[PDB]
């Protein structure tokens, strides 16, 4: 995954966050801070990636005003002749790690985390965005 960052001068590869057949996720440093980059390797160039890029740009415009919603801020169709890349802000912790990282979330923190999840869904629905992978 790090090899794909060699072509993006504004992003400096930092660490690999995961590899799957669908998306390879890695963390990179950018002038704005840390960013998570999911790289989709284009195996068949005949895939209508432009249609998906337009859908992602629509998602960015629809979710730009949501405070608890983080859409993909950048979608690059031909970032490299080999792969299309999606860029978004890096957050310190994912919920999967946060549960096991101290301080352990208290009952009041657990209620607060649940409350914010619901608020994120409410805001996304009113903003016209559905997650599909919650």
């Amino acid at each position: 995954v790090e090899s794909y960052f060699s072509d993006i001068h504004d992003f400096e590869y930092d660490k690999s966050l995961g590899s799957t057949r669908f998306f390879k996720v890695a963390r990179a440093k950018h002038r704005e801070g840390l960013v998570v980059v999911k790289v989709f390797a284009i195996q068949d160039p005949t895939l209508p990636l432009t249609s998906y890029k337009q859908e992602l740009e629509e998602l960015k415009i629809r979710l730009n005003s949501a405070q608890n919603c983080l859409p993909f801020q950048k979608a690059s169709e031909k970032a490299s002749e080999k792969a299309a890349m999606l860029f978004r802000q890096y957050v310190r912790d994912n919920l999967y790690d946060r549960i096991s990282t101290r301080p352990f979330l208290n009952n009041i923190e657990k209620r607060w985390i649940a409350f914010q999840i619901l608020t994120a869904v409410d805001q996304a629905h009113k903003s016209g965005v559905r997650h599909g992978d919650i």
Binding site: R111, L118, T119
Partner: protein, 66 residues
């Protein structure tokens, strides 16, 4: 799917039960200032919290589960 409510309905149904009222009235509105696009440096955040300290204690503790 017909049994799933809308996101706003769950927040209303659990308002005061699973989520204490303090989350909606102050925690969500106050905290939203820190997640805004306008970056508050760590120094600025401390000063903002210091300035509001009296209001935060009044809003969280009341005059007095607080």
């Amino acid at each position: 799917p017909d049994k799933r409510l809308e996101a706003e309905d769950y927040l209303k149904q659990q308002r005061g039960n699973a989520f204490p009222e303090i989350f909606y009235t102050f925690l969500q509105p106050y905290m939203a200032q820190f997640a805004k696009e306008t970056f508050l440096s760590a120094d600025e955040r401390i000063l903002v919290i210091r300035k509001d300290l009296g209001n935060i204690i009044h809003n969280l503790c009341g005059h007095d589960p607080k």
